[PDB]
């Protein structure tokens, strides 16, 4: 995979959807906002001033926190807290379930 | 390394046990009341998992070691290893031959003075197995990082060989369930001899009818004269009593043992209705239980090889056991399904010779077998398919070869049944290679 | 639902433990019938029915499956009598000698 | 001596266990799932 | 009654995963639904539904 | 206790780059403490039971 560096501002929470923004000559993240796109997924945590990485990779899927309950096959968006939330918004779509999920659960996502 | 896991953990209570002694006036817990230590047992008396250290009563600072480590033993067997045969080292395919039985042929002396050398061909008919299963098992132990757990080196080594014979219960699970398929195959092929019955759990006397379906059909197969009405060739043969199984749903099984007064002292008998050979449910969905012999299951071994590598970097090893198969079952051999629920009326049209070799302008005598689930008559539609020289069968079954044919032509037994407005035409099929003769003709009278 | 209600709800205890005790004893093993969940086994000797003797003698009169099959060990497991168990509903207790 | 034979030859399939595994997800048929070499005995397993 | 949890042991390492399996003690013929879920002091570390 | 594993299929073209892939083996445990400890006790007075 590719590495690179970049520094949390704002206590990344692990398998939350994540953002991204120029900083002081350095990427920073946070959570993703509610109803968006997300870049990264976070698989640790980073605290708000804490430096760490990100692993570039074509992933097919992702494993974040259900921010509701999640049936298969329903497209998934950004919601509270960088948590993936069922939608019908295309253009806030950026991956689809392949399993069902409970709320607080993680989900298995395919992007898209 | 953990902490803060209580004796319960995965544990839904239903009623707390120990408020039931203490609170006991009168009541049926009043016998637990005289015991000593009874609040003690009640805590840690269901199993501990996580495995908590213990400092001792005496001395605090000592720690209460574990004493003895039981090793558990428990082995799998197949219900059906007494079912299958021996072991074939070499070659791929087992060829079966069965040699029918011919006519009667009244002795005439008179008759005897032109028929000595009257050509009359052996009924044999063949059929073939090939390899199918071909599977390895895979457990990895690492020797180094198991000493740890083992302060001896009995129960070292008593591990290791439990790790080994999970490999060997791993495969008498999956020799079940391949043979359990073939089951399940043979039925989707339409290859049993199906026998239909009610939904058994529907009623009582549902039940009584099909104790007296498995017990005539059981004498039936067991007869000594034997018939050419159990098997999907239809040659003439019959079993024993001893090698016939029952092969039947644990659920199924029960409700006759009780509700089936004969049945019932009737355990521990092999003989009333063959060895019940208790399995779990058929995936087929009408299937309730099978009747079948014992040389029903072809099942031969090809290889039992246990090959071992070792990582060094790792400090472990791969154990890679390979199970090689003939998992295939014979066509002979009488097989009986008992199948409740919706059945097509006519299951199979087993055509006799289903192989031939017929002479340019020679003749074969063709018979089908219609096995109908019902009693009734149901009319074969002979039929030549293929072949591009008009050749022509008559209305029972004689091939009628058309003398300068040169083409493989294959014979149809086609039985309609259901209506004309969905015609389920199940067609048996025989073959037939044309063999030249270099015949002069052309038309006759 | 309750054995001591009815004379066909005896024929149906029974058919219940016919069933189980069959199960438990199958030679490919089974997850169920088990907290630990794994693929277990027992044998018909290693089958014990640890049963209330009221509840005992009122399978042995009625249902005459068990009548013939009251000097067995094969029908169900080694028929363990006891005075009861003291939880509300608990009426057998079908278990290995492992347990 | 033959040419293109089947195996399926007077096989009346009143339904296609193949199929059947595959398309099972819980339906009996999942017992057969973790079978490895599932297709190649229900191929040639009837003789 | 019981729901049990395949591997209720585990050493999981911070870039990995492991699979852990429900198995229900339903008295009655039905399929229940098991929600999963994760509890711990630290943050991330989710489940997938299956 | 040791439990039972899966079958996988041979294949040779694809055993040629994982002969060295591992299974951890589904081994569980259970641990059983003492949980009883008791006495009970009756004296015998013998020289005036003669």
Same mark, same amino acid.
């Given at each position: 995979? /590719?590495?690179?560096?970049?520094?949390?501002?704002?206590?990344?929470?692990?398998?939350?959807?994540?953002?991204?923004?120029?900083?002081?000559?350095?990427?920073?993240?946070?959570?993703?906002?509610?109803?968006?796109?997300?870049?990264?997924?976070?698989?640790?945590? /980073?605290?708000?001033?804490?430096?760490?990485?990100?692993?570039?990779?074509?992933?097919?899927?992702?494993? /974040?926190?259900?921010?509701?309950?999640?049936?298969?096959?329903?497209?998934?968006?950004?919601?509270?807290?960088?948590?993936? /939330?069922?939608?019908?918004?295309?253009?806030?779509?950026?991956?689809?379930?392949?399993?069902?999920?409970?709320?607080?659960?993680?989900?298995?996502?395919?992007?898209? | 390394?953990?902490?803060?896991?209580?004796?319960?953990?995965?544990?839904?209570?239903?009623?707390?046990?120990?408020?039931?002694?203490?609170?006991?006036? !009168?009541?049926?817990?009043?016998?637990?009341?005289?015991?000593?230590?009874?609040?003690?047992?009640?805590?840690?008396?269901?199993?501990?998992?996580?495995?908590?250290?213990?400092?001792?009563?005496?001395?605090?600072?000592?720690?209460?070691?574990?004493?003895?480590?039981?090793?558990?033993?428990?082995?799998?067997?197949?219900?059906?290893?007494?079912?299958?045969?021996?072991?074939?080292?070499?070659?791929?395919?087992?060829?079966?031959?069965?040699?029918?039985?011919?006519?009667?042929?009244?002795?005439?002396?008179?008759?005897?003075?032109?028929?000595?050398?009257?050509?009359?061909?052996?009924?044999?008919?063949?059929?073939?197995?090939?390899?199918?299963?071909?599977?390895?098992?895979?457990?990895?132990?690492?020797?180094?990082?198991?000493?740890?757990?083992?302060?001896?080196?009995?129960?070292?080594?008593?591990?290791?060989?439990?790790?080994?014979?999970?490999?060997?219960?791993?495969?008498?699970?999956?020799?079940?369930?391949?043979?359990?398929?073939?089951?399940?195959?043979?039925?989707?092929?339409?290859?049993?001899?199906?026998?239909?019955?009610?939904?058994?759990?529907?009623?009582?006397?549902?039940?009584?009818?099909?104790?007296?379906?498995?017990?005539?059909?059981?004498?039936?197969?067991?007869?000594?004269?034997?018939?050419?009405?159990?098997?999907?060739?239809?040659?003439?043969?019959?079993?024993?009593?001893?090698?016939?199984?029952?092969?039947?749903?644990?659920?199924?099984?029960?409700?006759?043992?009780?509700?089936?007064?004969?049945?019932?002292?009737?355990?521990?008998?092999?003989?009333?209705?063959?060895?019940?050979?208790?399995?779990?449910?058929?995936?087929?969905?009408?299937?309730?239980?099978?009747?079948?012999?014992?040389?029903?299951?072809?099942?031969?071994?090809?290889?039992?090889?246990?090959?071992?590598?070792?990582?060094?970097?790792?400090?472990?090893?791969?154990?890679?056991?390979?199970? #090689?198969?003939?998992?295939?079952?014979?066509?002979?051999?009488?097989?009986?399904?008992?199948?409740?629920?919706?059945?097509?009326?006519?299951?199979?049209?087993?055509?006799?010779?289903?192989?031939?070799?017929?002479?340019?302008?020679?003749?074969?005598?063709?018979?089908?077998?219609?096995? @109908?689930?019902?009693?009734?008559?149901?009319?074969?539609? #002979?039929?030549?398919?293929?072949?591009?020289? !008009?050749? @022509?069968?008559?209305?029972?079954?004689?091939?009628?070869?058309?003398?300068?044919?040169?083409?493989?032509?294959?014979?149809?037994?086609?039985?309609?049944?259901?209506?004309?407005?969905?015609?389920?035409?199940?067609?048996?099929?025989?073959?037939?290679?044309?063999?030249?003769?270099? @015949?002069? !003709?052309?038309?006759?009278?």
């Amino acid at each position: 995979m /590719v590495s690179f560096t970049a520094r949390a501002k704002s206590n990344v929470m692990a398998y939350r959807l994540l953002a991204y923004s120029q900083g002081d000559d350095i990427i920073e993240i946070s959570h993703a906002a509610e109803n968006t796109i997300p870049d990264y997924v976070a698989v640790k945590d /980073v605290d708000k001033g804490d430096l760490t990485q990100v692993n570039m990779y074509p992933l097919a899927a992702w494993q /974040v926190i259900a921010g509701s309950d999640i049936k298969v096959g329903d497209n998934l968006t950004t919601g509270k807290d960088g948590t993936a /939330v069922p939608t019908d918004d295309p253009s806030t779509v950026f991956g689809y379930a392949v399993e069902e999920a409970q709320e607080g659960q993680l989900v298995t996502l395919v992007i898209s | 390394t953990f902490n803060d896991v209580k004796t319960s953990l995965g544990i839904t209570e239903s009623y707390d046990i120990v408020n039931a002694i203490r609170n006991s006036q !009168g009541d049926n817990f009043k016998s637990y009341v005289p015991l000593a230590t009874a609040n003690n047992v009640a805590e840690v008396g269901a199993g501990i998992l996580i495995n908590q250290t213990v400092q001792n009563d005496f001395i605090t600072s000592l720690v209460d070691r574990i004493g003895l480590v039981v090793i558990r033993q428990v082995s799998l067997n197949n219900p059906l290893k007494k079912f299958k045969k021996g072991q074939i080292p070499l070659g791929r395919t087992i060829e079966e031959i069965y040699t029918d039985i011919t006519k009667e042929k009244q002795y005439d002396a008179e008759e005897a003075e032109q028929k000595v050398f009257e050509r009359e061909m052996p009924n044999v008919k063949t059929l073939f197995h090939e390899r199918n299963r071909q599977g390895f098992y895979h457990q990895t132990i690492q020797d180094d990082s198991l000493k740890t757990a083992f302060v001896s080196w009995g129960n070292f080594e008593s591990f290791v060989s439990s790790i080994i014979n999970a490999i060997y219960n791993s495969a008498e699970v999956d020799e079940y369930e391949y043979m359990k398929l073939l089951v399940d195959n043979y039925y989707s092929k339409g290859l049993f001899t199906t026998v239909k019955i009610d939904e058994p759990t529907s009623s009582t006397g549902a039940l009584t009818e099909f104790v007296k379906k498995m017990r005539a059909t059981a004498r039936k197969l067991t007869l000594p004269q034997g018939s050419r009405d159990w098997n999907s060739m239809a040659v003439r043969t019959r079993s024993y009593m001893e090698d016939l199984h029952l092969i039947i749903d644990a659920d199924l099984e029960a409700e006759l043992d009780v509700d089936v007064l004969a049945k019932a002292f009737n355990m521990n008998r092999t003989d009333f209705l063959g060895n019940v050979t208790v399995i779990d449910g058929f995936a087929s969905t009408g299937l309730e239980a099978v009747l079948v012999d014992k040389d029903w299951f072809m099942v031969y071994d090809n290889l039992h090889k246990m090959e071992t590598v070792r990582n060094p970097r790792g400090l472990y090893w791969n154990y890679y056991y390979h199970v #090689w198969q003939t998992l295939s079952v014979s066509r002979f051999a009488n097989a009986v399904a008992f199948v409740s629920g919706d059945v097509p009326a006519v299951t199979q049209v087993i055509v006799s010779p289903n192989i031939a070799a017929v002479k340019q302008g020679g003749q074969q005598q063709f018979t089908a077998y219609v096995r @109908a689930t019902n009693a009734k008559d149901h009319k074969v539609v #002979w039929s030549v398919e293929g072949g591009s020289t !008009g050749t @022509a069968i008559t209305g029972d079954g004689l091939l009628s070869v058309s003398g300068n044919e040169d083409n493989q032509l294959t014979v149809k037994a086609t039985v309609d049944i259901g209506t004309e407005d969905k015609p389920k035409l199940v067609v048996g099929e025989a073959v037939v290679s044309i063999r030249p003769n270099n @015949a002069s !003709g052309g038309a006759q009278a």
